[PDB]
Design a protein around this ligand. Structure first.
Ligand SMILES: [Mg+2]
Ligand SMILES: [Mg+2]
Ligand SMILES: [Mg+2]
Ligand SMILES: [Mg+2]
Lengths: 119, 70, 155
RNA sequence: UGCGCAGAUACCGGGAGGAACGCCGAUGGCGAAGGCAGCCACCUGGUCCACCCGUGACGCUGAGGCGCGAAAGCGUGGGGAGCAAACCGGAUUAGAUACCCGGGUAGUCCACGCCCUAAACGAUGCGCGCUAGGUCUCUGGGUCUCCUGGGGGCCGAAGCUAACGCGUUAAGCGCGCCGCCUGGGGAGUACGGCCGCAAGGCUGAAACUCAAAGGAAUUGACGGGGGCCCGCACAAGCGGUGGAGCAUGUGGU
């Protein structure tokens, strides 16, 4: 199993679960983690702690492949967010850059009625 | 700080090619900057939105970018 | 305490070691307002830390107390849908009280048949760091930490 | 509930397809209304200004007629990504034919043809003349501190109004024309006529019954409305009742 020196950490925040995946410089997944992938299950997978834990754990698995540095790419809003970033930063595993990249339609499909409470 | 018109000298803002100028009227997310920041008049601001949109189709200015450091 | 933030009712220093923190302790031991018997007990207890160990009572007392102060605890919290035990730090006045409360309680739970012994052993066993006081200390610290997930409300 | 080791979620590349166009974006703009929002081209309507050139009252309104008329709906034929009545499940509940969750047909989109209704709202018909100002704003023009039009807002002279409000964008003062009302329930129901493939639309009563039905403001009381305060009200504590025996009072027998 190859040694990667650097690459991407993708953080996908949501109001229900934070998930983090780590890839080589062409975006191919090395490792990944999520709230559920640590112990939490149901409504705790969102909590900034859950996010932190997942985040840290993914980084440890990548450091196994000898990963030394990353560009972070964050997507979505949710509680675990700054906390998963704060984690990667403090996991040793060096944080080269950060970048929000949340998808947004330039007015695309009709959202589900829950999401037009702003009707 | 500055309004983007306070910066420049005179320019044709019907000119959908001059990316050197037109590029300054976009945010770092490549979004068309509001009047309050462009320092433009309602009328000019209208004309520009048009020229900017024409550039985008030729490939010269962006529809979007991503926020760096968040 | 709606209006003011209440003055911490000060205590006369001890008429022996000259320490507020002692009388504090003595007060907790006191029952039906019988401060006399209360005091006898705590002193007679310092005597069973000569007869038992080479150390100075006060130092043992201080150092046991310092051992039963919690650092964290779960303060309860309602939110419209469930109940949340939220861990916050512990302000030094509360530490003071929980410890001294706990000691006496831990101590009166012990087996030996006499006031001044129960106090004494507890005091020793907890400055070693193995009190039944210290149980209901690491438990609180643990109860926080297990609820470390909800520790992001803390109001 | 569901989906996932037939490898989902998250990530990178490629492709297919439908719908809607982020920022600009506004207190904005256009339209008679309904309504109109990526960008390009063609075809086409309305409107404003300036010049003061032409016609010479050629005007206003407008029963009936005709045409337009959101959404939902109907017919034939396409299309179908996301969303979603009905429906099928998971929940919650005293129950829950609901609100919350997972799915999902019609439908939403396009062609052609129907339906013709709405809190179709400015709840304010159209036109003209007259009656202080201030302020913000869109689009013109000039001699460009500002002035003169045309639109969009707020404040308010006079006056009006039950009041609240309106107040050169009148609900003012006046003329012209249209349309409508005449206590509430029965009832936009019945009968009849007309229209529609249908659903249904337009027009639209009576018997009987009530002494009310209403509008705006007032003082209270109230709110699972807001802001700010207090009390052993809760929290932080210490000791208790609730369990036992007896005393006492009461219920009941
Ligand atoms: Mg329709
Ligand atoms: Mg159809
Ligand atoms: Mg549903
Ligand atoms: Mg009807």
């Amino acid at each position: 199993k190859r040694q990667v020196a650097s690459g991407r950490a993708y953080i996908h925040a949501s109001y229900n679960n934070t998930i983090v995946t780590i890839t080589d410089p062409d975006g191919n997944p090395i490792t990944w983690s999520s709230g559920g992938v640590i112990g939490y299950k149901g409504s705790r997978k969102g909590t900034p702690y859950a996010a932190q834990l997942a985040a840290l754990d993914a980084a440890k698995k990548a450091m196994a492949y000898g990963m030394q540095s990353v560009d972070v790419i964050v997507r979505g809003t949710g509680a675990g967010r700054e906390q998963a970033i704060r984690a990667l930063q403090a996991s040793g595993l060096q944080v080269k850059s950060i970048v929000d990249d949340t998808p947004v339609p330039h007015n695309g499909c009709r959202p589900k009625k829950k999401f037009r409470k702003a009707s | 700080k500055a309004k983007v018109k306070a910066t420049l000298g005179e320019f044709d803002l019907r000119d959908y090619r001059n990316v050197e100028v037109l590029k300054r009227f976009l945010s770092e997310t490549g979004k068309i900057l509001p009047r309050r920041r462009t320092g433009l008049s309602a009328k000019e601001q209208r004309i520009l939105a048009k020229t900017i949109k024409r550039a985008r189709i030729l490939g010269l200015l962006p529809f979007t970018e991503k926020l760096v450091r968040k | 305490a709606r209006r003011r933030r209440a003055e911490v009712r000060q205590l006369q220093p001890d008429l022996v070691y000259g320490d507020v923190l002692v009388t504090a302790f003595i007060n907790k031991i006191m029952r039906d307002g019988k401060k006399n018997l209360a005091a006898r007990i705590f002193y007679d207890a310092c005597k069973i830390i000569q007869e038992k160990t080479g150390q100075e009572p006060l130092k043992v007392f201080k150092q046991a107390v310092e051992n039963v102060k919690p650092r964290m605890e779960v303060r309860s919290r309602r939110v419209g849908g469930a109940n949340y035990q939220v861990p916050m730090e512990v302000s030094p006045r509360r530490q003071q009280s929980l410890a001294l409360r706990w000691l006496v309680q831990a101590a009166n739970q012990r087996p030996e048949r006499r006031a001044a012994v129960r106090i004494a052993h507890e005091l020793m066993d907890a400055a070693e760091g193995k009190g039944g006081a210290v149980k209901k200390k690491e438990d609180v610290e643990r109860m926080a930490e297990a609820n470390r997930a909800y520790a992001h409300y803390r109001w």
